Amino acid sequence: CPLMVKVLDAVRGSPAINVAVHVFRKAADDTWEPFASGKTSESGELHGLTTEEEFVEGIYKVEIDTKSYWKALGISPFHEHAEVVFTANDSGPRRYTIAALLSPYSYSTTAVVTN
Amino acid sequence: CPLMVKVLDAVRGSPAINVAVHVFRKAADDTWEPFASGKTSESGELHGLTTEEEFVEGIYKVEIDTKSYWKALGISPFHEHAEVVFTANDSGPRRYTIAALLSPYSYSTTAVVTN
Amino acid sequence: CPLMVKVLDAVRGSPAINVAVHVFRKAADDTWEPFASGKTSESGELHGLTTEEEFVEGIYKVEIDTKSYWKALGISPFHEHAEVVFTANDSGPRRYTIAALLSPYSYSTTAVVTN
Amino acid sequence: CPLMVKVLDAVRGSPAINVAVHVFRKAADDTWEPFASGKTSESGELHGLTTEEEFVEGIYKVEIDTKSYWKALGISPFHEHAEVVFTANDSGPRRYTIAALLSPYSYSTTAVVTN
Ligand SMILES: COc1cc(CO)ccc1Oc1ccc([N+](=O)O)cc1[N+](=O)O
Ligand SMILES: COc1cc(CO)ccc1Oc1ccc([N+](=O)O)cc1[N+](=O)O
Numbered sequence: 353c354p355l356m357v358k359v360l361d362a363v364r365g366s367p368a369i370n371v372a373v374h375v376f377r378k379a380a381d382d383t384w385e386p387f388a389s390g391k392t393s394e395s396g397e398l399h400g401l402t403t404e405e406e407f408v409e410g411i412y413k414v415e416i417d418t419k420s421y422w423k424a425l426g427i428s429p430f431h432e433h434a435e436v437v438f439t440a441n442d443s444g445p446r447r448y449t450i451a452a453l454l455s456p457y458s459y460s461t462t463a464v465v466t467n
Numbered sequence: 468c469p470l471m472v473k474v475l476d477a478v479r480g481s482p483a484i485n486v487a488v489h490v491f492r493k494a495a496d497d498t499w500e501p502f503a504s505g506k507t508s509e510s511g512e513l514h515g516l517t518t519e520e521e522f523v524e525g526i527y528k529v530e531i532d533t534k535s536y537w538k539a540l541g542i543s544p545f546h547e548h549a550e551v552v553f554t555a556n557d558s559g560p561r562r563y564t565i566a567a568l569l570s571p572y573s574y575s576t577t578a579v580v581t582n
Numbered sequence: 583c584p585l586m587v588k589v590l591d592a593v594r595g596s597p598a599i600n601v602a603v604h605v606f607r608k609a610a611d612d613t614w615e616p617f618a619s620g621k622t623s624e625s626g627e628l629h630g631l632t633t634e635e636e637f638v639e640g641i642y643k644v645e646i647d648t649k650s651y652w653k654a655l656g657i658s659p660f661h662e663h664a665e666v667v668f669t670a671n672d673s674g675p676r677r678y679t680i681a682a683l684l685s686p687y688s689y690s691t692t693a694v695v696t697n
Numbered sequence: 698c699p700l701m702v703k704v705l706d707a708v709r710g711s712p713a714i715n716v717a718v719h720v721f722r723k724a725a726d727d728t729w730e731p732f733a734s735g736k737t738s739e740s741g742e743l744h745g746l747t748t749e750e751e752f753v754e755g756i757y758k759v760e761i762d763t764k765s766y767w768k769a770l771g772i773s774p775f776h777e778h779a780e781v782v783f784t785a786n787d788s789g790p791r792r793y794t795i796a797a798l799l800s801p802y803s804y805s806t807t808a809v810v811t812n
Contacts, residue, residue, distance in 0.1 A: 360796075363593060365660055365687025365808045411547060430578045430595055432526060432552040438545050451705075453575075453807055455685040457595030460575030460805060462798055463545040463710045475681075478708060480695045480775055480802030545710055566590075568692055570800040572710025575690065577683055580595045641777060660783050660808040662756060667777040690798075690805030693775045 354407045355388075355440075355448050357398040359416060362455045363427070367396025371421045375401055378411040387412065413437045414450050422456055430457040438463065469522040469562050470503075470555075472513040472529060477570045478542075482511025486536050490516060493526040502527065524556040529565050537571055544571040551576050584637040584677050585618075585670075587628040587644060592685045593657075597626025601651050605631060608641040617642065639671040644680050652686055659686040666691050699752045700733075700785075700793050702743040704761060707800045708772070712741025716766045720746055723756040732757065758782045759795050767801055775802040783808065 355375070359368040371392045376384035388401040414436040422429035436450050449464040470490070474483040486507040491499040503516040529551040537544035551565050564579040585605070589598040601622040606614040618631040644666040652659035666680050679694040700720070704713040716737045721729035733746040759781040767774035781795050794809040 360688075360807060360809060362685035362688035362807055365810045367809065367811070430553055430580070432554065435550040435552065437547040437550065439547065453688060453805070455577075455592035455688070457580070458575065458577035458592035458683060458685070460573065460690070460798070462573035462705060462707055464705060464712065465545070465572070465710045466712070475692060475694060477692055477800035477803035480693045482694065568690075568803060570707035570803070573705075573707035573798060573800070575683075575805070577590060577592055578595045579590060579597065660810070662782040662784065665780040665782065667780065668775055669777065687810070688805065688807035690803065692800075692803035695775070695802070 353399055353401075353447065354404050355401050355450070357392065357401070357414060357416070358449060358451045359392050359396045359398075360451070360453045361396075361421075362453050362458075367394065368392060368421055368452075368454055369394055369396060370424075371396075372417040373398050373401075374415045374417070376413045376415070378413070384413055407440060409440055409442050411437065411439050416452055418454055418459065421454065427456055431459065434459045434461065436461050436463075468514055469519050469560065470516045470527075470529075471562075471564045472505075472507070472516070472531070473564060473566045474507050474511045474513075474531060475566075475568045476511075477568050477573075482509065483507060483536060483567075483569055484509055484511060485539075486511075486513075487532040488513050488516075489530045489532070491528045491530070493528070499528055519560055522556065522560070525554070526552065527555050528552045531567050533567075533569050533574060536569065542571050546574065549574045549576060551578075553578065583629055584634050584675065585631045585642075585644075586677075586679045587620075587622070587631070587646070588679060588681045589622050589626045589628075589646060590681075590683045591626075592683050592688075597624065598622060598651060598682075598684055599624055599626060600654075601626075601628075602647040603628050603631075604645045604647070606643045606645070608643070614643055634675055637671065637675070640669070641667065642670050643667045646682050648682075648684050648689060651684065657686050661689065664689045664691060666693075668693065698744055698746075698792065699749050700746050700795070702737065702746070702759060702761070703794060703796045704737050704741045704743075705796070705798045706741075706766075707798050707803075712739065713737060713766055713797075713799055714739055714741060715769075716741075717762040718743050718746075719760045719762070721758045721760070723758070729758055752785060754785055754787050756782065756784050761797055763799055763804065766799065772801055776804065779804045779806065781806050781808075 375388040476483040591598040720733040
């Protein structure tokens with residue numbers, strides 16, 4: 353699993369379940385091409401987006417559909433979505449965790465890059 | 468001043484100065500068109516992006532060029548930029564402050580919206 | 583104004599108003615003695631806590647009464663308060679802004695320190 | 698494991714290893730009595746602080762020794778430590794994760810309370 357997404361809810365103090373997540377790769381013409389997607393699990397985690405073979409160096413975007421999350425909870429949010437854009441680079445045997453902590457008008461995201 | 472951007476540096480404990488910010492507005496054809504741009508001042512704030520006349524309802528994207536920021540300081544950061552996307556003025560004119568706090572592998576953004 | 587405190591509410595996207603703040607300074611006998619207190623204003627800011635004469639070197643603790651804040655709004659939050667502890671003025675006088683962003687199960691705090 | 702601590706480093710994008718963590722329980726005389734302690738592992742996690750039998754309702758403080766962490770990395774930090782203070786309450790079969798994300802002049806903490 354070279355790429356995992358983990359989302360927490362700062363209002364409820366819980367994993368953010370069933371949040372849709374879309375990952376894109378930047379193509380040679382500078383467009384974003386769909387790469388991988390899924391819905392966070394009960395643990396707020398999304399595993400199995402990609403494989404080491406397909407996850408080559410390049411620029412990726414991870415879009416977390418925060419607006420739908422909040423709306424399903426009856427809560428008015430600010431952002432359309434949260435976007436995390438980064439370059440994946442093969443300097444070493446790397447796993448990338450993209451973590452996000454959500455509030456209705458604020459979010460933070462952090463990258464945990466290990467081995 | 469219906470739209471202001473404020474950026475702080477969590478490593479230095481200081482305003483993040485000379486950060487480039489580009490704003491875009493989703494067009495009729497579903498494309499991101501350029502709307503305004505600027506750079507943060509010595510206080511980390513960016514004022515004068517737009518006017519209340521110009522700042523009509525729409526979906527806006529505020530792209531904060533954090534990578535250029537960290538690179539100019541000898542740090543190779545994780546993200547390309549921080550993107551903040553939101554619907555604005557959908558219940559009449561409001562004043563928006565988009566704040567961001569930056570670390571090399573992590574950022575948070577919050578919106579303060581006043582009437 | 584060598585010490586200012588600013589608090590925002592990540593659920594509302596607004597300044598966090600009427601937040602009580604107590605400041606303490608570690609004494610010669612290793613005890614937390616009362617130093618100053620106040621409440622955030624309509625802009626979420628707390629000014630006038632101390633003076634440059636009074637604000638000598640020391641270890642200070644800024645206790646932000648987030649539980650009282652959230653309770654007055656029908657929310658049962660996780661934390662009792664947010665505590666910010668730091669050495670101040672150890673290389674001469676500085677001006678400190680202690681900022682905090684609050685959600686019911688989460689908070690962040692940052693310091694901006696200027697000369 | 699009713700109480701687990703997880704610490705991340707926002708500057709390096711990694712777990713924060715070998716951070717000392719001290720947990721206290723508030724006694725009837727309002728003093729903090731040592732309760733449990735340890736050092737975060739290679740995964741930035743600290744498991745096995747306590748047991749369900751000993752972790753009764755009450756007010757606890759978790760102190761994360763952030764200053765020593767940063768100093769061991771050659772980095773000048775702002776806070777003496779990060780403190781997280783909360784009431785543990787038996788409304789349900791609960792596991793408490795106290796997470797913290799560290800930067801030299803900023804930290805965030807979140808509580809993830811599950812089952
Ligand atoms: C405050 O702790 C977190 C802060 C952020 C800000 O974006 C994101 C996640 C946080 O909590 C975790 C982050 C990463 C993580 N991980 O899989 O290495 C685990 C986290 N956690 O507290 O369970
Ligand atoms: C973590 O507290 C803050 C977070 C952000 C971005 O998520 C922006 C400001 C925060 O607190 C402040 C810190 C400094 C400051 N200032 O004027 O030097 C103002 C702040 N604030 O509360 O807007």
